[PDB]
Structure 1
């Protein structure tokens, strides 16, 4: 049970431009979406970027009405069982080629977003594209911090990584930016101490859902427990997201 977030690709990175050009696809007219799976549609307000893996060869698929989806074959295969055994993508594109593309992420209050790398993004789970909410996701916060620290090493620009984080969810136990708090209280120094992070992912999901209050959006002031299904429905209604299982 996942929610597939349609992240609109607005301007493609220079080396991708050639490929799209050579394959007759144009990002300015057609809608080209990176599809990222999430279990927390209520946190979509706090998106600061978008994650893809440099090591994954993504497919570009035709979804109809001039919509195109960038994901993995296996991810797309699911989005259709709701009648083929295999769907040939129009062409494939490596993750590295997409880094630095500008994007518009649904509901995100942060502007001028970009596609950034994360090497540990799986090919066998979800869509190959990952959501980034550093305020409420410890994993995201830690990866963000790394990219900010070693931009040359990861092949990005320091400006691309948004470091001003606006609070989305208030919690009793952890305050307004629970990922920041949990990374700090549990002394998570890097994305390498994997014990404290797996513990942190759990605690953040629990308090966020059960003791969380929205600080932003249509349902500002509501318990997350109540707001979550309502925010989900809105995005689906607005054609910004859709349901997808495995």
Structure 2
């Protein structure tokens, strides 16, 4: 299914502090992670934030050994099966997390934050979405929408990094395939679901089968060869795990 990426919450947004303190959860001693599903572990170098949804109430679940996972009930269920209902420690709306600072595995970009995405599926994945605007058309379009409507989304405009670091070279779409595809397909909105599904498949196929890594341990290797190795490295290093639905 997916790789679940453990994105560490390092500094919680002010609006969330009372909550975390009320529940005796300290993000500096305890390891509290947002668990974001991805199909493309090799793109984790290019994370520029992570996305949660204000439309979702997340559970905070005790995963064991000092680790806590922030995700939907449904996804936590699926992780544990690998009870029928798992009670969280507490629940938290995505809006409450916005602006929190995070450490995302392998990301070269610094000072990452939790940002909103209005199209994140609750019924698919974990409710938390990795953000790699160089290579994910959805991510590129949401990033552009955030920068254009910061008041709507409840963010600082300068939280959106619009200066993208290339991580995969393709001959067909350049070094930032998502930018190329979104401009060339004239995709206007995060809500353009069918168009974005098409762009995503194009990006994934060209990137995976014809891409070359520009960064990390496997720099210069084909994505096709690198990606399972990046996956295994993340898993061995405790930064990720496999998530099936």
TM-score normalised per structure 2: 0.98
- Larger deviation: 186-195 or 85-94? 186-195
TM-score normalised per structure 1: 0.97
Residues 137-184 of structure 1: CA deviation (Å, up to 9, x unaligned): 000000000101111121100111111100000001001000000111
Task: Tell me the distance in 1 between the aligned counterparts of 2:30 and 2:42.
Answer: 28
Task: Tell me the distance in 2 between the aligned counterparts of 1:100 and 1:230.
Answer: 32
Change (3 A) 1:171 1:91: same
Gaps of 5+ in 2: none
Offset at residue 192 of structure 1 (A): 4.0
Whether the 8 Å CA contact 2:119–2:190 is kept in 1: the answer is no
Offset at residue 196 of structure 1 (A): 3.1
SS in 2 for 1:103: strand
Residues 79-114 of structure 1: CA deviation (Å, up to 9, x unaligned): 1112x2221101111111000000000000000000
Q: What is the correspondence of 1:193-204 to structure 2 with a 5 Å cutoff?
A: 193-204=192-203
SS in 2 for 1:79: helix
Task: Tell me the distance in 1 between the aligned counterparts of 2:64 and 2:186.
Answer: 47
Change (3 A) 1:177 1:98: same
SS in 2 for 1:88: coil
Gaps of 5+ in 1: none
Change (3 A) 1:24 1:205: same
Task: Tell me the distance in 1 between the aligned counterparts of 2:11 and 2:191.
Answer: 33
Offset at residue 195 of structure 1 (A): 4.2
Offset at residue 199 of structure 1 (A): 1.7
SS in 1 for 2:61: strand
Q: How many residues align?
A: 245
Task: Tell me the distance in 2 between the aligned counterparts of 1:195 and 1:34.
Answer: 27
SS in 2 for 1:229: helix
RMSD: 0.9
Whether the 8 Å CA contact 2:11–2:100 is kept in 1: the answer is yes
Task: Tell me the distance in 2 between the aligned counterparts of 1:194 and 1:25.
Answer: 37
Offset at residue 197 of structure 1 (A): 2.2
- Larger deviation: 85-94 or 191-200? 191-200
Whether the 8 Å CA contact 2:35–2:126 is kept in 1: the answer is yes
Task: Tell me the distance in 1 between the aligned counterparts of 2:179 and 2:94.
Answer: 28
Task: Tell me the distance in 2 between the aligned counterparts of 1:217 and 1:22.
Answer: 40
Task: Tell me the distance in 1 between the aligned counterparts of 2:3 and 2:217.
Answer: 19
